[PDB]
Design a protein around this ligand. Sequence first.
Ligand SMILES: O=C(O)C1=C[C@H](O)[C@@H](O)[C@@H](O[C@@H]2[C@H](O)[C@@H](O)[C@@H](O[C@@H]3[C@H](O)[C@@H](O)[C@@H](O)O[C@@H]3C(=O)O)O[C@@H]2C(=O)O)O1
Ligand SMILES: O=C(O)C1=C[C@H](O)[C@@H](O)[C@@H](O[C@@H]2[C@H](O)[C@@H](O)[C@@H](O[C@@H]3[C@H](O)[C@@H](O)[C@@H](O)O[C@@H]3C(=O)O)O[C@@H]2C(=O)O)O1
Ligand SMILES: O=C(O)C1=C[C@H](O)[C@@H](O)[C@@H](O[C@@H]2[C@H](O)[C@@H](O)[C@@H](O[C@@H]3[C@H](O)[C@@H](O)[C@@H](O)O[C@@H]3C(=O)O)O[C@@H]2C(=O)O)O1
Lengths: 329, 329, 329
Amino acid sequence: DKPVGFASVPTADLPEGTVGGLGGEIVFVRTAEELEKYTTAEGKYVIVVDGTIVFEPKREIKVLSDKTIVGINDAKIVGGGLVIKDAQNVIIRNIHFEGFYMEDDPRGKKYDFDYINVENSHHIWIDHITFVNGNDGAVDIKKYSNYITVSWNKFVDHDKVSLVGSSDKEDPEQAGQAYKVTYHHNYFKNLIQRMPRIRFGMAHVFNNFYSMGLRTGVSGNVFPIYGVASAMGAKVHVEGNYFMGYGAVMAEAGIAFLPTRIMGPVEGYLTLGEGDAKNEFYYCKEPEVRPVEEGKPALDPREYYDYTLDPVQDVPKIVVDGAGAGKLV
Amino acid sequence: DKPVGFASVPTADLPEGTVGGLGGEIVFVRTAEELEKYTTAEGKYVIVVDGTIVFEPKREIKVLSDKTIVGINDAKIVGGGLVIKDAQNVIIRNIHFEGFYMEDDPRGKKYDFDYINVENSHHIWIDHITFVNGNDGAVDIKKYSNYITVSWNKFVDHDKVSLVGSSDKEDPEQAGQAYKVTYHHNYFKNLIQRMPRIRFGMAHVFNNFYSMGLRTGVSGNVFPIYGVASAMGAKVHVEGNYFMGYGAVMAEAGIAFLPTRIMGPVEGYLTLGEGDAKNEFYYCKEPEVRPVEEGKPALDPREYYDYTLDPVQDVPKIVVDGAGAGKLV
Amino acid sequence: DKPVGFASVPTADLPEGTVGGLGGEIVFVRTAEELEKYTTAEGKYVIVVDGTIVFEPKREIKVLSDKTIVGINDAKIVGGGLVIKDAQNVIIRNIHFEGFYMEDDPRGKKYDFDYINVENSHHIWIDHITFVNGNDGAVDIKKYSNYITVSWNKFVDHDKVSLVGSSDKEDPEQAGQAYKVTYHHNYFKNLIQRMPRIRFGMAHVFNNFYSMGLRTGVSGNVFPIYGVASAMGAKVHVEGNYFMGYGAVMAEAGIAFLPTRIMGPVEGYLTLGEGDAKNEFYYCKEPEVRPVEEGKPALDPREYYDYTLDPVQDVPKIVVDGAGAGKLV
Ligand SMILES: O=C(O)C1=C[C@H](O)[C@@H](O)[C@@H](O[C@@H]2[C@H](O)[C@@H](O)[C@@H](O[C@@H]3[C@H](O)[C@@H](O)[C@@H](O)O[C@@H]3C(=O)O)O[C@@H]2C(=O)O)O1
Ligand SMILES: O=C(O)C1=C[C@H](O)[C@@H](O)[C@@H](O[C@@H]2[C@H](O)[C@@H](O)[C@@H](O[C@@H]3[C@H](O)[C@@H](O)[C@@H](O)O[C@@H]3C(=O)O)O[C@@H]2C(=O)O)O1
Ligand SMILES: O=C(O)C1=C[C@H](O)[C@@H](O)[C@@H](O[C@@H]2[C@H](O)[C@@H](O)[C@@H](O[C@@H]3[C@H](O)[C@@H](O)[C@@H](O)O[C@@H]3C(=O)O)O[C@@H]2C(=O)O)O1
């Protein structure tokens, strides 16, 4: 009912952090035209997606401020995505996104279809969504967006999962102050990269289940490459996550998922939880780390918000049981 | 109608070897409660499983001596397994086991669910069963069990297939005299390990078809590792089996299924058939062998029972055509 | 409506090149017996396959000269193939072949079932067909066959795709003058080898989409090995084709699809298009080449027929949208 993490952080005009269209007008939508009518409307709306909505032609629609998009009756958006642009205060929950896969574009480099594309927007909660094999990104977060929680989603069979900050060339000061994102209790399943890949900002990645089997049926990237990456001086803390790679034969040949990655050209920072906050890694390469200061978590999310960490051994069952669309009441 | 191999070996009270509930009372079961009522009953029963039986919650049920559990009408046990404990003389045939896979436990190390778990039991025939992707073991054989035939089953998409002897620390004399198991005419399909893995005892592995493709859709072990393993001084003979691994590209990179494996800490023994009893290996590593004495089969099953060996080139078609549930009349 | 490439080349008795049963008698067939009645009939026939035709037992049927075999209503030939032998002037279009896979023969070396087997025949057009995981070949071209176009087909999940010339021991002069084959606008999807593999003759391979993901569910060859191969002094030109292999992890371990291959024992020749006729390669090894003469295309198809080359970047979408059965009107 309320987000945990960066989406919950209060501002002047959003005293309770992200609340979407709370207090607004309730509308049920059953077609792409109806959905787009209300996501592009001005004002508070709770937009209830009832069942399957097919976008033909495939396309993305804009979403303005103060919206809740909530699915019921196994809500599906098929061949459609949401661009949240120059906006704030949007909640998206309990919908299954599928149908952006373009078999003529197996590396997701032509069509640019993202299921959720957040551009210069802040206070956004993406929760209890299932995303299945899209084209380009599943949830991308760009152009100085900020204060995002991506929680309890299930991402399946998808290559480039979540890019946070799309350009090495953005303003170091401004970008360093944006891109504050929390990823927690997500079920990441047979995915390839960017979970998240973050430039500049701050990422708290906790209590997610990474179940990295192969992406079959397709060409392009069949084997999972890496989970979390920290680039362009980002501050990332990764704790209490459970990583399972793709097995003993491959690991013995020196081929294995990389749980955390430092990337450049200006290296990011990233630390791991330890002790009660440790991650677990099975069939993985050794995680890459780079602290801001020896013995300190590169990010202290307790400076920004409260949260409780589940013991890592409990994470698989909690995440399988709870994550993705069709589980919320 | 009668087992071949170690299940058929006569004792004082079992003059015809394994016969299950022959002569006993015939009962049809259509629920988990009814099945458990009769598998835990004292006395002779022929228990006919008619159609699908779902176990919610998932769980294993005990089976006592002198039972036949036989499926009809595409019998399925879903999310349930059978523990045959401190017992003897049990036949299980023509049932499809599925539904023990636990996606929060991709290495099968938490829940401990076995489709068939044989503990301190002997004279057990497991025949014409299909087992699909369980949790821990498909057919495990533990705690000094003995005189088992596992024949004409189809095992599919499963990681840890059949463990025979669960502890390096069992009594060398006692364990050396137990765990006499014959595995024949099984269709082993996209499986990872232990086909069987045996400690201490004696394993005759003949005329099985190993079709080792990838286990997809899952994390953990995606690539088949090894077929038969002989550990703790076990005596294993492997003859007339057809092994097909997962292809030229992998084999050329030095990555390939290992058909037979010697394991420790006290090394087992294992020999191959040759000439008319040879195995065939395609896309495999060279099999590991270790004879008890130069030029002798580490086990001579003709000292214990009669059998006829199919020519290895005939094994794929015979096994595909005949193995698994839903083929017996 | 008319072939492009070698099938269109005029002869004395075939002034318009391949036209199949144009002008002949139209017949609708709905059973394997009816189909075989007409493919083995003498004379001109347009044979319209309406819906699914199942061959039990699985088998191949002969097709004589001057035939059009054309599917409607999602036409399927299941467990059947066509042998075009000592014949000419045959068109096959808009049918889905499936059901030759033999799981007891994962390397396709026992049963010898080909979906289309062209023997000592010429002027054959194979167009808008979908072929799914057969046994041995999908389209083999043998025994001095000649003047073939294989265009706009979709080949899926199949190991040994198209062998052109089955013997190193055929007559160098005669074979050098036969096996003139054009492969264009085919969607090659999760296939293993021979796309085509050609001995002796001349192959023009243009504007095909190679989407080389894994062949899962099966043992044998799970990883795609190589696309086009030129053997026994064949003359092959490969231009405007788009190759996508199976990803970064494998490529970084030195494991990757080989787009073009020179094979012996007498090496073939093969050249690539460049500039406006270039191919694209992603996640592939470097293509093998061997020109007849420095700076010349090993084959100049403009000496034999006219064609227009699509820009390679357009090929994936054109081929996905247009290739395979069920798309022709
Ligand atoms: O079911 C078990 O958890 C189990 C039962 C065994 O009796 C015990 O020895 C132990 O199995 C080990 C290992 O822990 C298990 O993970 C598995 O390892 C295989 C393979 O044998 C290894 O060489 C390596 O490649 O890792 C593999 C893997 O599955 O990750 O099996 C061994 C074994 O002894 O058989 O756990
Ligand atoms: O259909 C056949 O059985 C067949 C037809 C060929 O004309 C003949 O040369 C021969 O094919 C060989 C080989 O036997 C076959 O197995 C296959 O090999 C590939 C690959 O080319 C090899 O480099 C190696 O990687 O193994 C592969 C494999 O499939 O296991 O194809 C070659 C060939 O010449 O093309 O059999
Ligand atoms: O969506 C994109 O096209 C894209 C967005 C990134 O912000 C940009 O840096 C760039 O991504 C590169 C690379 O081009 C892309 O292909 C991918 O590469 C991965 C992996 O990171 C590499 O180490 C290598 O293994 O190749 C992989 C692959 O997917 O082929 O991602 C990198 C990146 O920076 O994250 O394109």
